Amino acid sequence: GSFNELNAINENIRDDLSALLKSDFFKYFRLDLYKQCSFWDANDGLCLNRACSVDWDTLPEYWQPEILGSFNNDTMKEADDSDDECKFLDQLANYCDVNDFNGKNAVLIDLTANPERFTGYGGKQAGQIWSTIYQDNCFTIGETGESLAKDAFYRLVSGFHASIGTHLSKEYLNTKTGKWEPNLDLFMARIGNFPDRVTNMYFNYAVVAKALWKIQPYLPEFSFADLVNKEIKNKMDNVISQLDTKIFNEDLVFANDLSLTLKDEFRSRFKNVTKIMDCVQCDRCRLWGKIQTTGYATALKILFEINDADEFTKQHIVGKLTKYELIALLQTFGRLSESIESVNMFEKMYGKRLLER
Ligand SMILES: Cc1cc2nc3c(=O)[nH]c(=O)nc-3n(C[C@H](O)[C@H](O)[C@H](O)COP(=O)(O)OP(=O)(O)OC[C@H]3O[C@@H](n4cnc5c(N)ncnc54)[C@H](O)[C@@H]3O)c2cc1C
């Protein structure tokens, strides 16, 4: 039912969204190569005894997890204090220091050259990080909406977890031919045989779509004279304008039910998630983890704040988002759009699977 509608919406915007995310404005993401993990050392501390790999001795050295999850340094660019990602959307048409972008070794990564895919990352470390995230699902008891908050937090994490599982299944490395291709059996093992994980990805899709729909009317211009950035903002509006659905009438994140205390806690909770991404040993995994956790935190900030705000406050909320956050939000939407498409694609592979049996 709900899948049918969100799926139809996705069919319409899938290619335009993908095109938009490849643009110069959206293709880069600021990442601090410096990692500050509390649970352990992620700066120089390596992961031994395959504590960070999924269940490689018989495969070439260039297909080891450490390589599959490594960055492509050739596309990366230097990130200075003048980097627009640190600026408020209001400023587009110091800054990095003001908005707390205090990275010791920040760089701009080319997301087109560093896609989310199977990297072989996993084992005990990946398991510990996921468990820690699900376990930190705690809110002040007695607060109005405590159970709703715990349910929403869980669903967002689960949909995030599922989107990653879907991507590593869709873009899997065949160790025989050495080509990246869909792996149906893995998809079934990570997503297909667990219906609720698919539901949670649709939930996340609706949450992010709603945040984008809500801010669209208040997005400031990207530039006045620059034709390139001008057309970019136009293409963004064209995508968002097609997201309208009555599903948005639903209070997906219980914005109307959660107390102000729970909202801050909820927001603070996702901040901790973004932070534990620094413990992820796999570079590409950490990058996309940072992108998506930030995207979800941004969707939450938007939905919680725009809910009961007057028009003057709406333009303020949207205008103070940083380019960094907007990139995170749209790239996260792009991963969810791709995840739903992958589910559709796999359903067809499944069909032609049982037919060949
Ligand atoms: C932030 C982060 C980013 C990552 N990015 C990548 C990546 O880009 N590419 C790549 O190959 N690997 C990536 N990984 C690894 C990947 O998520 C898996 O942990 C991995 O493939 C090994 O899988 P597994 O079966 O051991 O456990 P997982 O499949 O992670 O399972 C963890 C446990 O959680 C449960 N679980 C699984 N999915 C869900 C869900 N959606 N909802 C509720 N429970 C679930 C399982 O039953 C199991 O108990 C990342 C890990 C983290 C922590």
Ligand SMILES: CCN1C(=O)CCC1=O
């Ligand atoms: C009782 C311990 N606990 C919390 O405090 C939140 C999640 C959890 O299991």
